[PDB]
Amino acid sequence: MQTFQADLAIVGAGGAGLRAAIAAAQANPNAKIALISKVYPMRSHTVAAEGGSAAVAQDHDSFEYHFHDTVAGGDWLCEQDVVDYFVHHCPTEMTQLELWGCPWSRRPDGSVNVRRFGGMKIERTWFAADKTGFHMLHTLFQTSLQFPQIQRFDEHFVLDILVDDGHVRGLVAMNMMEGTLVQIRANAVVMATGGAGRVYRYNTNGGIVTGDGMGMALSHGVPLRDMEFVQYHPTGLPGSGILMTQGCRGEGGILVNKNGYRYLQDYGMGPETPLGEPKNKYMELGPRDKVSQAFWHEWRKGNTISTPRGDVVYLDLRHLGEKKLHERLPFICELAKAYVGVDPVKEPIPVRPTAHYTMGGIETDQNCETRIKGLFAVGECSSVGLHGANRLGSNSLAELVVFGRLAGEQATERAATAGNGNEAAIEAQAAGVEQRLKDLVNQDGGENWAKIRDEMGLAMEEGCGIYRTPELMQKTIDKLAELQERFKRVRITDTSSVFNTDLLYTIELGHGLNVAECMAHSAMARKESRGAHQRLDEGCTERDDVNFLKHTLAFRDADGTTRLEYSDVKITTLPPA
Amino acid sequence: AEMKNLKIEVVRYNPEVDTAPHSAFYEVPYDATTSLLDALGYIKDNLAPDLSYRWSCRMAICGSCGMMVNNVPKLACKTFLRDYTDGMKVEALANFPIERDLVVDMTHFIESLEAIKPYIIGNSRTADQGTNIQTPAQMAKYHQFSGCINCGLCYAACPQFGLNPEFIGPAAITLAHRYNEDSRDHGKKERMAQLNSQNGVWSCTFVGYCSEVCPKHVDPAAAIQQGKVESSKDFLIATLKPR
Amino acid sequence: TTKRKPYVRPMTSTWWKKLPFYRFYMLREGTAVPAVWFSIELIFGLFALKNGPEAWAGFVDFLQNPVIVIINLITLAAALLHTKTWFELAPKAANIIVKDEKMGPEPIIKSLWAVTVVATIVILFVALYW
Amino acid sequence: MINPNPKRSDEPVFWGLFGAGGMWSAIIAPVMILLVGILLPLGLFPGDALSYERVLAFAQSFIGRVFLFLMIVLPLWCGLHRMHHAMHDLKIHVPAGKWVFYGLAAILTVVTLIGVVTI
Ligand SMILES: Cc1cc2nc3c(=O)[nH]c(=O)nc-3n(C[C@H](O)[C@H](O)[C@H](O)COP(=O)(O)OP(=O)(O)OC[C@H]3O[C@@H](n4cnc5c(N)ncnc54)[C@H](O)[C@@H]3O)c2cc1C
Ligand code: SF4
Numbered sequence A: 001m002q003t004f005q006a007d008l009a010i011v012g013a014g015g016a017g018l019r020a021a022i023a024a025a026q027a028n029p030n031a032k033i034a035l036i037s038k039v040y041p042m043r044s045h046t047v048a049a050e051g052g053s054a055a056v057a058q059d060h061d062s063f064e065y066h067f068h069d070t071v072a073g074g075d076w077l078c079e080q081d082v083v084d085y086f087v088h089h090c091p092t093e094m095t096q097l098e099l100w101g102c103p104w105s106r107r108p109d110g111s112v113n114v115r116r117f118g119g120m121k122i123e124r125t126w127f128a129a130d131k132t133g134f135h136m137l138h139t140l141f142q143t144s145l146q147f148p149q150i151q152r153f154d155e156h157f158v159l160d161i162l163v164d165d166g167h168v169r170g171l172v173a174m175n176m177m178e179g180t181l182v183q184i185r186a187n188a189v190v191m192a193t194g195g196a197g198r199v200y201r202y203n204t205n206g207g208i209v210t211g212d213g214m215g216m217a218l219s220h221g222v223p224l225r226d227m228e229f230v231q232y233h234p235t236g237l238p239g240s241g242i243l244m245t246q247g248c249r250g251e252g253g254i255l256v257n258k259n260g261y262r263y264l265q266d267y268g269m270g271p272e273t274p275l276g277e278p279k280n281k282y283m284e285l286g287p288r289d290k291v292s293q294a295f296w297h298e299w300r301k302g303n304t305i306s307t308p309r310g311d312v313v314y315l316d317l318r319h320l321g322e323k324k325l326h327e328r329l330p331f332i333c334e335l336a337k338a339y340v341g342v343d344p345v346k347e348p349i350p351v352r353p354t355a356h357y358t359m360g361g362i363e364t365d366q367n368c369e370t371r372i373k374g375l376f377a378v379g380e381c382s383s384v385g386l387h388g389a390n391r392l393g394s395n396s397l398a399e400l401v402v403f404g405r406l407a408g409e410q411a412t413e414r415a416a417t418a419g420n421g422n423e424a425a426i427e428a429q430a431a432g433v434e435q436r437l438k439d440l441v442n443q444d445g446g447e448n449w450a451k452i453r454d455e456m457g458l459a460m461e462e463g464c465g466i467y468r469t470p471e472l473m474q475k476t477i478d479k480l481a482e483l484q485e486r487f488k489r490v491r492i493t494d495t496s497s498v499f500n501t502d503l504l505y506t507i508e509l510g511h512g513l514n515v516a517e518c519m520a521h522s523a524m525a526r527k528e529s530r531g532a533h534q535r536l537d538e539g540c541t542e543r544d545d546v547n548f549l550k551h552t553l554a555f556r557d558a559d560g561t562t563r564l565e566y567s568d569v570k571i572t573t574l575p576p577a
Numbered sequence B: 001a002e003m004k005n006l007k008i009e010v011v012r013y014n015p016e017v018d019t020a021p022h023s024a025f026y027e028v029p030y031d032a033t034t035s036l037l038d039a040l041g042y043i044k045d046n047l048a049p050d051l052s053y054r055w056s057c058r059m060a061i062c063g064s065c066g067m068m069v070n071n072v073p074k075l076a077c078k079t080f081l082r083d084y085t086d087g088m089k090v091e092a093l094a095n096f097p098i099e100r101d102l103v104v105d106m107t108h109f110i111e112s113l114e115a116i117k118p119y120i121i122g123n124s125r126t127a128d129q130g131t132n133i134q135t136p137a138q139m140a141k142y143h144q145f146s147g148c149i150n151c152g153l154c155y156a157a158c159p160q161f162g163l164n165p166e167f168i169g170p171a172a173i174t175l176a177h178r179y180n181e182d183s184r185d186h187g188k189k190e191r192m193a194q195l196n197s198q199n200g201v202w203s204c205t206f207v208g209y210c211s212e213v214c215p216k217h218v219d220p221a222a223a224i225q226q227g228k229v230e231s232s233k234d235f236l237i238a239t240l241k242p243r
Numbered sequence C: 001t002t003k004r005k006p007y008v009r010p011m012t013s014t015w016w017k018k019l020p021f022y023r024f025y026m027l028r029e030g031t032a033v034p035a036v037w038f039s040i041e042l043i044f045g046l047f048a049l050k051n052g053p054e055a056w057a058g059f060v061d062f063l064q065n066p067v068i069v070i071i072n073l074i075t076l077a078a079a080l081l082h083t084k085t086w087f088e089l090a091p092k093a094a095n096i097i098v099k100d101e102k103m104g105p106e107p108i109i110k111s112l113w114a115v116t117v118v119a120t121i122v123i124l125f126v127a128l129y130w
Numbered sequence D: 001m002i003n004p005n006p007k008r009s010d011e012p013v014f015w016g017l018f019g020a021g022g023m024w025s026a027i028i029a030p031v032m033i034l035l036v037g038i039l040l041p042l043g044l045f046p047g048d049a050l051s052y053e054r055v056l057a058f059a060q061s062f063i064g065r066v067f068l069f070l071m072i073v074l075p076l077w078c079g080l081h082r083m084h085h086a087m088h089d090l091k092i093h094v095p096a097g098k099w100v101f102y103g104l105a106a107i108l109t110v111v112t113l114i115g116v117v118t119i
């Protein structure tokens, strides 16, 4: 194994990872930052966004309002000091992104415009178009090119990290094109591997969002906090799971069942608002969870339209006019026309809820540091305590640059004052990763990894859906344990070395199984209803701040079992009520 | 019901066994919603596990999908089997070296894009002063050219690049123009060097296939022409200076 | 050592024969043949014109070959293609903004073809009516 | 790696000429080919508009001389430029191709110049 020297190494070229590389470069102009990703940085999942990034801007807005919408939206499971830091640092990072060339849409006077997302009362979401995550990822990356401190390792699959005496010392990754392993030494490692929505059969995520960094963090005792809160976005295409942006409803679109009845008024979201004026908080602009759950109820009432790709409801957008449909939203119209064969000017779009965002992630303090000294986690793959039981719309993007910058500067600090460690132990850990890989390659049994992935997606979609019951959740737990036993009988029949996607996808499946078990157990033990976690059995259909005002921590020990602990939630100025 | 089956021909290549690429034939069930990316998923799941390829976002925005469909450069996630009932041949993206199956050596693309210095240069404004002032008018000068997803279809479309591998290429040029026409940038002279090269704007003969195959409608050829204009201005100005 | 063996596909001299778009491009460049042919003829008739009515009459007899009339008809055809594709491609080198939107190419194309028709008319008028 | 300090090209010169030429032949060439290649050697013109006397009279006029020089020379630089690049497009190797095609262009430009100062 060849070895590279780096001050700090980042695992993930997403918005969090790129912003962290930039902040760490600007912090230490003499550092050698090893930025790693299994795809070229412009291929990270962040490109796929259409919503926007939250940042307080309007004069009639305040950091108190953003703080309040975040805490309340999270059902008081947010670390409130972290939320305070976040809302106080959003305008500096969105402004800084504007300075780096990000083409935020403009008011006719030259300032940056904002629109309403996540149900906030005061609009504060900056946007480029319906192409915001695209322009922000490409802006961060193209700005990252100008910093020579950032040695990139594009298309490098980070296999494991190296831990000895409670401090991180580097990581072992595979040169994907070459099929050869590489050691990277660094007294600071930042995890920015993105969420893990690919464990669901139907999701809005890219193929690379397999949550590998989370599983790597599990392998070394770090706990995964609040994994039960999987956020479903509503309106999404069937079969594919491709997002229909909330802007569709934000322009006047309606949700209808099989009877043409705007069903949302029957679930506390009434009265019905006219086709003319859409009102925030009402009808199709109501709370996200209540709209998804409303789909579940309409499915129980048999009011859903049966379709081969699955049961759906209809997003009717006809009442906008030719010019507003074809000309104003180009990417969304092209999307619908392409993937469901429907012209939004002529016909209504078939949509249904879909797995979207991973509120959970690696446990981190207020400076994005985990229980291992020198190891950091930022982005969707982390859990700084900003989202709690439910993340607010357009907040994750702002988290990427704010906490990306923070994680960069802090990682520089920790790498500066690390001291040295036992070399024989570290080389022993690297040799251990090498041997573990050899073991996975020589493993035989004849089981197909793909059917295990499919059955895992079905298990997660069934037991851990919008609504959840103890019988089906226990069923998903037992099914995940069964698939865990079947993963040891998998045989990787592709023995090639140049871009062997077989092996890599298999490893991704392993990480996915571990993380999924953490999710299902974290939910089965949380006997209450909070945010995206919604149960139906007696005694758990409401919010319990007396017994469950606490974070679910999920450990995975060496014996393959998923244990749970609970931590307390930091309150500052907004107590739960 | 019963789904129809389509015979897809894929250009495989294993650099450890094969001397030269070769076709393989796979029957794939499909409907009115089956994309080529989905088809590749099925083939690698049930027919040949050693088929490698690049992909991610599943909705044509990331840009790793690039491949050839009947000698037409397309994104595999924006190509649907319903339109190919009479034969379908999938080769790796054209005018690039084939590393494995449908994966190519994207190195030169990366190198060119880095070489045109794609970032804001010469601005001293700091975050504590607020954002720059830019009108929708000032944005429209370059907005279209920013939606480039670095997918590389245009490099498979341009024939001048297939003849000249040192051609920095349509996408790199278009990005450089995007930063030259940004009202917030003052670093045009830093990229004029690569632009005026014979490997720069002066290697395009205006074939125009790039803008045609562009899945994000960037229109890179127009950026190449405006770049020839700016390069001619630069030439004359550099001539009228004596010494 | 690397187990990579990157395969480079060759690009023949017949790359354009495949796709019709390429064929159209190569034709569009192939218009250069009859245009320079026509300028050669223009030199022919110039020096035949200054060499007296004798040489001039010999030149006009050359134009009546009639295979030369065939070639000149093809010359007019190719030159018309050249006007078409030229007016199509020329507006892309302009970055014009009309009220927050990048305009063209239809107005420019209409203007160019208008100027061309005006030219053709004025030329036939001066050349034939007087 | 790409050259960090590449050689600026002289192309902007020929691309310039090839421009103005192509524009010229775009707007003026078709009617000229109709006049000279079709209408004249077929007698399809009223009276003696295309006879030797009137033609020569137009030629020895100043405007006739200039229009003739442009009508000959501009399409020459244009088309010859296109041929130089088409050589490359066809992978036909031509020694001193630059000097060949553009040299012929300047040759016929001097020739046309000697013709428009009247022989
Ligand atoms: C359609 C859509 C729209 C959205 N819109 C919004 C919005 O408007 N506002 C908002 O706030 N949020 C939005 N989100 C959510 C939010 O943007 C995402 O959580 C965000 O993309 C998270 O990105 P990230 O920085 O965590 O890294 P990601 O973008 O998830 O990328 C993960 C990175 O980790 C790397 N990586 C992963 N595994 C490995 C490995 N094993 N080895 C090496 N590298 C690895 C990848 O290469 C990549 O660089 C949206 C999400 C979707 C799907
Ligand atoms: S412009 Fe179209 S083709 Fe050229 S790179 Fe961006 S996406 Fe690929």
Ligand code: F3S
Binding pocket: B157, B158, B159, B160, B161, B169, B170, B203, B204, B205, B206, B207, B208, B209, B210, B211, B220, B221, B224
């Ligand atoms: S097709 Fe090729 S020649 Fe230039 S205009 Fe486009 S890069």
Ligand code: FES
Binding pocket: B037, B055, B056, B057, B058, B059, B060, B061, B062, B063, B064, B065, B075, B076, B077, B078
């Ligand atoms: S799959 Fe990401 S762009 Fe087609």
